[PDB]
Design a binder for this molecule. Structure first.
Ligand SMILES: [Mg+2]
Ligand SMILES: [Mg+2]
Ligand SMILES: [Mg+2]
Ligand SMILES: [Mg+2]
Ligand SMILES: [Mg+2]
Ligand SMILES: [Mg+2]
Ligand SMILES: [Mg+2]
Ligand SMILES: [Mg+2]
Ligand SMILES: [Mg+2]
Ligand SMILES: [Mg+2]
Ligand SMILES: [Mg+2]
Ligand SMILES: [Mg+2]
Ligand SMILES: [Mg+2]
Ligand SMILES: [Mg+2]
Ligand SMILES: [Mg+2]
Ligand SMILES: [Mg+2]
Ligand SMILES: [Mg+2]
Ligand SMILES: [Mg+2]
Ligand SMILES: [Mg+2]
Ligand SMILES: [Mg+2]
Ligand SMILES: [Mg+2]
Ligand SMILES: [Mg+2]
Ligand SMILES: [Mg+2]
Ligand SMILES: [Mg+2]
Ligand SMILES: [Mg+2]
Ligand SMILES: [Mg+2]
Ligand SMILES: [Mg+2]
Ligand SMILES: [Mg+2]
Ligand SMILES: [Mg+2]
Ligand SMILES: [Mg+2]
Ligand SMILES: [Mg+2]
Ligand SMILES: [Mg+2]
Ligand SMILES: [Mg+2]
Ligand SMILES: [Mg+2]
Ligand SMILES: [Mg+2]
Ligand SMILES: [Mg+2]
Ligand SMILES: [Mg+2]
Ligand SMILES: [Mg+2]
Ligand SMILES: [Mg+2]
Ligand SMILES: [Mg+2]
Ligand SMILES: [Mg+2]
Ligand SMILES: [Mg+2]
Ligand SMILES: [Mg+2]
Ligand SMILES: [Mg+2]
Ligand SMILES: [Mg+2]
Ligand SMILES: [Mg+2]
Ligand SMILES: [Mg+2]
Ligand SMILES: [Mg+2]
Ligand SMILES: [Mg+2]
Ligand SMILES: [Mg+2]
Ligand SMILES: [Mg+2]
Ligand SMILES: [Mg+2]
Ligand SMILES: [Mg+2]
Ligand SMILES: [Mg+2]
Ligand SMILES: [Mg+2]
Ligand SMILES: [Mg+2]
Ligand SMILES: [Mg+2]
Ligand SMILES: [Mg+2]
Ligand SMILES: [Mg+2]
Ligand SMILES: [Mg+2]
Ligand SMILES: [Mg+2]
Ligand SMILES: [Mg+2]
Lengths: 190, 57, 76, 137
RNA sequence: ACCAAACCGAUGCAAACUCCGAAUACCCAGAAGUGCCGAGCAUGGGAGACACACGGCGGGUGCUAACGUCCGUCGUGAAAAGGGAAACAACCCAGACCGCCAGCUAAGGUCCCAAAGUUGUGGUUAAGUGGUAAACGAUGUGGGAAGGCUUAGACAGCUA
RNA sequence: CCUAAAGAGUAACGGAGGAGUACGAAGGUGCGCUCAGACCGGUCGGAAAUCGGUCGCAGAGUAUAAAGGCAAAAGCGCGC
RNA sequence: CAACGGAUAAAAGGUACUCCGGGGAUAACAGGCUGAUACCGCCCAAGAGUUCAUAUCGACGGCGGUGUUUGGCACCUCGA
RNA sequence: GCUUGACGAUCAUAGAGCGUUGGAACCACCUGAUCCCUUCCCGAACUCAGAAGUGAAACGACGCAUCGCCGAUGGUAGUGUGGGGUCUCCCCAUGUGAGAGUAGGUCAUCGUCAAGC
């Protein structure tokens, strides 16, 4: 499932990283977090890009196998080529059982077709945001947060306070007194 | 202790900074070899003009 | 065109850099306003020129509140 | 067309267009986007021409964003005029494009309808483009 | 059911914006060696010159047009022959005191004109591509990572 | 002021603006004090006059363009 | 004395009736470089064509070619 | 060493916000305007004479990261020298290397003197 193999990287810099991408088909990467000194690793380009196609590739914990050592890890950030779109770099956050981790989690809009604002009012559905930033312990990190639009009329706004998170999950942005909009129903363009 | 240094390329058209690095080692013309002590001051002129020289060691 | 005007340059800036030996009356900075402030042993002219009142070397330090930049003279 | 309501200065130096677009290279609002893969500049008549060719093909719902704004004035010297005698007058407004910049966005349509409509828009633009999808990171 | 300052969040741009911020280049001091035997400075005798050109890098202007024009900084020509780029001031290699029917190399080259590999190993091209060219178009051909159907009968054909 | 390439300097019939003054106090010194703006309450004003309170930190001011400065304020007032 | 290092205290024009010394250091003709413009092709396809995008055309936009017009420059020729 | 004052060092990892707490001394509020001194009016502020009251306000001490402020590692951008390309822009070798963001820190640390134990 979510398993990666990586090797230790000892050659650093602009020149060494360019030779990894050009002549070896590898990707530089870093593992930090927990309570340890950070470590520099390297991994296959065609291996990381295959896992990224999975929907829950950023809201799931991954078993990283560096050398023979196995440790549990979550994907924190990801650098991509601005034009071609492939991954150039990635950093990995170590996972500890009792410590809060702050991650991005995708949303799921269900039963959009039965929306009250759609069938009767004839209005469109617009998703203002498609992912939300959460914070929780690893044991209760969800693969997605599910938002329904069954009881939504025309002109109605869905906010962060409206949707409900699983037990032990906190919405970060809502804590800072900012409930940004999630979705709405509006009149047709024409 | 010391190090072989040999001038293999011409000095014509080089940067004035690089001409003084070759002259500071005692090199006069192509295929001419000198003895210079391996000190950080002498190494710095060798590195600045690395492409004009052959360092046998 | 109605643009072809300009004024002659004034040759401002730092005249003596940090660590240089100085003598009394030496001009250190030419300024508009006070980018640098007169530290110990340094006087200020009416066009904000910084000059040396004693002998020593330039120090240049950012200290105090307001984050000001000071030029002072210290004994070598 | 598109141009600033007012500007601090009437003219600008030509400058240079270098680098990649690290900022503005994500699908920030919609689900699909048209992204530039070569460097050039759009003249605010190609932007309007490509917008009308894009919204017409949909004609049923959907939200459309434009992420490029022409804010650089360019001059032109009239015919039969010698060199010098001051800078020329402003004729049109342009936007600098670096490789990897998102040009248009759309949501509320199928992937195939967006893919067909962005093909029509790309035929009015003087630079290479590509079709991309929104991702978390 | 129109418009809506302001505020919150997301998201771009700036030679005459800056919460930031290099590499280089400039000053200063202390040191080893080299310097053609000097390099620096001062004071006097004699000048010439004050129409520059191209190439690279950083810019304004022009159309990021011109063997255009105007600046900064290097190199060459001017005032520099020799070899190479077919011929070709300014490009690359290299700075001619004289002589030799001696040798080694640089850039560039090794089938013939014409000096030197019809050299060796593995592949690609069929277009004289090589030996001029853009949007766009195409079952050309080689390589790679993956997919939708299908022996419970996939696609093309035939027998009603 | 930009061009001007983070020391100085640097051209174009390049891009933008000002000057050919003012002040016997608008100078010296000692002492003393902080603006713009917002909100609330308050008679004719009501958005804005003078007033009281809270926040505010320079978004004000500087004789005159722009740039660089200004808490020991270089800003404001009074006596000599 | 602003033509702001200020020729004198004191100064405007015509020459197709013209003249001399010079210059391709500098224009007009032709040549050269360039190709904004010009001309000729191609790409997209809203639309016109009773219906039907491409029989025939083709808006808004894009990419080239030729030196072929109007230009830009001032490299050759002012002892023709 | 424990508490309070005065003067410094250094200028947010030191600030802001919220809460608890301090009166024996010190300090602050406090009483009065006769006497020095004062208000472009007012003992409000400055000043004088004080010892009835309080720690309310102010100030200090102590806790908390919500804000503010610091902030890696790695990667990316740029860049000196030499060399290349399909040369408006890039790549290679070598040296250098941000800004932003991420993990994460921060409710400061000192010096001299005088008073209470
Ligand atoms: Mg490099
Ligand atoms: Mg050379
Ligand atoms: Mg001008
Ligand atoms: Mg100038
Ligand atoms: Mg200047
Ligand atoms: Mg004085
Ligand atoms: Mg320019
Ligand atoms: Mg940018
Ligand atoms: Mg700038
Ligand atoms: Mg000699
Ligand atoms: Mg002259
Ligand atoms: Mg002279
Ligand atoms: Mg001259
Ligand atoms: Mg000249
Ligand atoms: Mg010149
Ligand atoms: Mg020249
Ligand atoms: Mg140039
Ligand atoms: Mg130029
Ligand atoms: Mg040119
Ligand atoms: Mg020229
Ligand atoms: Mg040059
Ligand atoms: Mg030169
Ligand atoms: Mg020479
Ligand atoms: Mg000459
Ligand atoms: Mg020659
Ligand atoms: Mg030759
Ligand atoms: Mg020859
Ligand atoms: Mg040739
Ligand atoms: Mg060779
Ligand atoms: Mg032969
Ligand atoms: Mg053979
Ligand atoms: Mg072969
Ligand atoms: Mg051929
Ligand atoms: Mg051919
Ligand atoms: Mg400068
Ligand atoms: Mg410089
Ligand atoms: Mg000059
Ligand atoms: Mg004027
Ligand atoms: Mg004043
Ligand atoms: Mg100012
Ligand atoms: Mg003060
Ligand atoms: Mg004159
Ligand atoms: Mg004059
Ligand atoms: Mg004169
Ligand atoms: Mg006359
Ligand atoms: Mg004559
Ligand atoms: Mg004559
Ligand atoms: Mg000529
Ligand atoms: Mg002339
Ligand atoms: Mg003719
Ligand atoms: Mg002509
Ligand atoms: Mg053309
Ligand atoms: Mg029709
Ligand atoms: Mg041509
Ligand atoms: Mg012709
Ligand atoms: Mg010329
Ligand atoms: Mg001729
Ligand atoms: Mg003639
Ligand atoms: Mg003749
Ligand atoms: Mg780093
Ligand atoms: Mg950093
Ligand atoms: Mg920061």
């Amino acid at each position: 499932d979510f398993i990666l193999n990586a090797q230790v990287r000892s050659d650093l810099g602009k020149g060494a990283s360019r030779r990894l991408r050009r002549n070896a088909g590898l990707v530089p990467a870093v593992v930090y977090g927990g309570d340890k000194e950070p470590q520099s690793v390297t991994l296959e380009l065609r291996e990381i890009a295959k896992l990224l196609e999975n929907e829950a590739a950023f809201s799931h914990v991954i078993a990283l196998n560096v050398g023979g050592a196995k440790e549990t890890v979550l994907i924190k950030a990801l650098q991509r080529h601005p034009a071609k779109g492939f991954v150039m770099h990635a950093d990995f956050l170590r996972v500890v059982a009792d410590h809060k981790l702050t991650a991005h989690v995708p949303l799921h809009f269900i039963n959009e077709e039965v929306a009250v604002g759609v069938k009767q009012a004839g209005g469109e559905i617009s998703h203002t945001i498609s992912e939300v930033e959460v914070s929780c312990l690893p044991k209760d990190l969800p693969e997605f947060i599910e938002v329904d639009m069954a009881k939504v009329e025309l002109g109605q706004i869905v906010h962060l306070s409206d949707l409900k998170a699983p037990k032990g999950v906190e919405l970060v942005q809502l804590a800072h007194g900012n409930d940004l909009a999630v979705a709405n129903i509006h009149a047709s363009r024409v | 202790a010391t190090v072989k240094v040999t001038l293999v390329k011409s000095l014509n058209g080089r940067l004035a900074n690089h001409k003084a690095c070759v002259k500071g080692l005692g090199l006069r013309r192509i295929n001419h070899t000198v003895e210079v002590q391996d000190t950080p001051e002498n190494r710095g002129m060798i590195n600045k003009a690395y492409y004009l020289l052959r360092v046998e060691g | 065109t109605r643009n072809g005007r300009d004024s002659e340059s004034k040759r401002l800036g730092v005249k003596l850099f940090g660590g240089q030996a100085v003598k009394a009356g030496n001009i250190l900075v030419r300024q508009r306003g006070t980018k640098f402030h007169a530290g110990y042993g340094v006087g200020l002219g009416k066009d904000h020129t910084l000059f040396a009142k004693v002998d020593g070397v330039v120090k240049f330090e950012t200290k105090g509140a307001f984050g000001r930049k000071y030029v002072s003279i210290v004994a070598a | 067309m598109l141009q600033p309501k007012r500007t601090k200065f009437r003219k600008q130096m030509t400058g240079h267009n270098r680098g990649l677009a690290h900022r503005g290279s994500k699908v920030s609002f919609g689900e699909y986007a048209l992204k530039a893969t070569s460097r050039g500049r759009l003249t605010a008549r190609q932007i309007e021409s490509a917008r009308r060719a894009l919204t017409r093909h949909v004609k049923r719902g959907g939200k459309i964003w434009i992420r490029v704004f022409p804010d650089k004035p360019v001059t032109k010297k009239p015919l039969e005029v010698r060199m010098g005698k001051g800078k020329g007058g402003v004729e049109y407004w342009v936007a600098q494009i670096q490789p990897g910049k998102v040009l248009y966005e759309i949501e509320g349509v199928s992937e195939e309808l967006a893919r067909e409509a962005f093909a029509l828009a790309a035929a009015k633009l003087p630079l290479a483009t590509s079709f991309v999808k929104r991702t978390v990171m």
